[PDB]
Amino acid sequence: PLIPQSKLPTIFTQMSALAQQHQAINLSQGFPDFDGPRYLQERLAHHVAQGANQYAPMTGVQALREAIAQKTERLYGYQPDADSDITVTAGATEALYAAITALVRNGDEVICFDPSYDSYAPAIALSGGIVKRMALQPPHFRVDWQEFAALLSERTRLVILNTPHNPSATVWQQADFAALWQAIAGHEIFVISDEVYEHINFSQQGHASVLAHPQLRERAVAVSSFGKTYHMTGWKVGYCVAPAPISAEIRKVHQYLTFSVNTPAQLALADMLRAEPEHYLALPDFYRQKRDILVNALNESRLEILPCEGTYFLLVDYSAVSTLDDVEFCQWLTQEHGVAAIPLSVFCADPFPHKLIRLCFAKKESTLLAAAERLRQL
């Protein structure tokens, strides 16, 4: 038995096991416990039946890329080229890995922000990139542009940002993108904007996308996730929008990663985009309702809430209630009050000196109400 030497030297699985062993309300898992639109499900079955089950084009089904182009135009006032700027991928996860892999060379420095979604770091490492982390500080987790400016070097190749922000639930304002552009304008720095929660922004101001900034747009990759937008994360279909030159390099990697993406699913997704276009304009109110169920319960609790601007996650400060560290507090919470959450420390590379936990409210009303009742015991 020959053993490989890892080129990359379980939390989410503990919580669901502890939540199961103690019948705790699951608010840790970052996906819905309700299903998606059946129109989409119905169109999938229709395309499978019509026999559209063989390889799809490498860049994605034509109808889908064109439908995505139109959506982009309606939303951000600019129309990408459907044949060269849009690429369908097996989930946003693959788009991120493809974009990162296409842009990061050995020794390149990539600026990221913590707390962070855990998939960026590994991809950057597999391409031999160096991660430079900015530690966003609670409660507002705003980007300290002066700290940012200091992280730049001649090796800075890419900036990966996530907005709305998982796990902090904060969002980037138009002004933040303006500041990013002012900071990287004179440098050869690419931008990857993880905007999978693009339709879950509670500001009246609306979602501020990198695609709305004319200059950043020409040097950036926007990543979206259908699984996240249509409440069906297991469908694994996403895409990225980027200038032709950049999308071309994303495609070179993608083509050998998976080559093509589930064909029926794509056609179904195309139908959904064309049949119910204003569908996402409703998601903000849809999730704001769910968010408040948890917020109102926590206002009668010794637990404190941080402002939730986006994503379907919420941050809670348990200082007044306990002295334990977040990881073990969550274990205590699950075991003593039947509510499972995720400690914010698992999203940080370096020590996080705070008493914050992440709660997901992308759940059925009954789940949120049951959670609310238990949160009110603290």
Next chain:
Amino acid sequence: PLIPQSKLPQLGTTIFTQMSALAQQHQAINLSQGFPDFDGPRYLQERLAHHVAQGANQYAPMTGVQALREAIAQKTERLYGYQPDADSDITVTAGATEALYAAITALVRNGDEVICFDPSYDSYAPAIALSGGIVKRMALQPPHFRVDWQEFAALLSERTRLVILNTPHNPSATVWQQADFAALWQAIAGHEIFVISDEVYEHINFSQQGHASVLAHPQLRERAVAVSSFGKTYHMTGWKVGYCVAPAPISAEIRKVHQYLTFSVNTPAQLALADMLRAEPEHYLALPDFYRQKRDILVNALNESRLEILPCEGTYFLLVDYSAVSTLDDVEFCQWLTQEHGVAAIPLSVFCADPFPHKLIRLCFAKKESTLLAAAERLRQL
């Protein structure tokens, strides 16, 4: 305007989409496409809809749905005589393509040398390059494309880290026998050389002994990765669901990569496939006879044409030598054939990194009887 330097200034192919475009322009029988022109099993499609309807549409486990991994485990045991561990040895991926990229990315470090065999499936090389690995090619020779073990031994070095073999072999339609795997073990037994066996066409082996898998060899097994594709087996290439079998330690590393590649794969599809595996195991057991019938339609047709055929031992591809018909190189010949005789084929030279001094073209017989009969009637005129 920012333009990225490509990590792959490696000019890439459009040979397949171009042949199809030429075929439709001249309404030619398209035998160049490496996928069915008929649909998959109805039961599989039904079960997909069933799981979608039952709400099984959220993230599946990172290593794949538990039920699919066990069904694969018991299938492996029945076929090759050994039962892998369902939890640690099997990993579901979004197509064999991702299983290959993941396995290759997890084992190839910068500078590592990987031995490959031409003619070759075009996805191995680029994945190796992205990990900074060095490709060392063996040029299998017609008519039998048998491995030259002396040539192989010569390619080995202290930097050889991996051997990628594809059996049944696309595009040569040849296969590895039990003795070939025996030879492989003898050749690499003393070095830190891992093996990746692309066995997507494992259920399309026309041998009397049947498909010889790397998984059937006790020693090669604990240092190898077998790659499978459900899309190939169930005639629905667009479903993109594959997997790889490897020892816990190797799977552990494949998984570390896969997890950040796609993380999880279409959940309802995985459950649908598991049902298909448990419910109708006979579907793959009858695939050889199913394809031998389609193959023979082409074999008998050209048995009077002046074109010659080489032995097709596996895959749903067939090699045709056109020496007695034209002096054109294979690329110009396939164009001429599509335009003048209405039958689209793929030149074998596009599958080779180095010059291929032969007049061979690849035909795909994974087509409806009506498609194969029409092609047969046209190939007759040569």
